[PDB]
Design a protein around this ligand. Structure first.
Ligand SMILES: [Zn+2]
Length: 151
């Protein structure tokens, strides 16, 4: 089976996709992410605190993607090829340093594309129900934190 950490990290990709679907391209750049147990935190560059409605919709879409049990594809490509294939969208706010010449790219079709070297579940269904616990907007820094728990 997959550890709760691997499942929670995989959830970050699902939640990020939902975030972009609801908030739009203005929220496409991830500042950072981290997992501790069954708790995951996604921080993206954004300019406002979403409404409770928007937060609920992000949660709904995330769970719906998990329910769809879509495959989580992993691409291991030379950096140059990865860029031609996925473009800038595969990067986070801070692009992978140039000394890294081979990239592993995670892909959830029409949902999320991200250069990531961590371990993931094979499908989104293996993640399980997700619950957003806290959302915090840091105005000065222009960062939106989404704290969730994998039930
Ligand atoms: Zn990942």
């Amino acid at each position: 089976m997959y550890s709760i950490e691997v499942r929670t990290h995989s959830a970050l990709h699902v939640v990020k996709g939902a975030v972009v679907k609801v908030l739009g391209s203005e929220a496409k750049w991830t500042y950072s992410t981290y997992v501790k147990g069954n708790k995951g935190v996604l921080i993206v560059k954004f300019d406002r605190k979403p409404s409770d409605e928007e937060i609920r919709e992000i949660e709904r879409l995330a769970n719906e993607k998990v329910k769809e049990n879509a495959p989580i594809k992993i691409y291991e490509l030379p950096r140059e090829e990865a860029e031609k294939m996925f473009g800038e969208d595969m990067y986070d706010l801070f692009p992978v340093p140039e000394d890294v010449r081979i990239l592993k790219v995670v892909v959830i079709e029409d949902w999320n594309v991200n250069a990531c070297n961590k371990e993931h579940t094979k499908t989104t269904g293996e993640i399980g129900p997700i619950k957003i616990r806290k959302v915090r907007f840091r105005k000065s820094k222009g960062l939106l934190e989404i704290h969730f728990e994998l039930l």
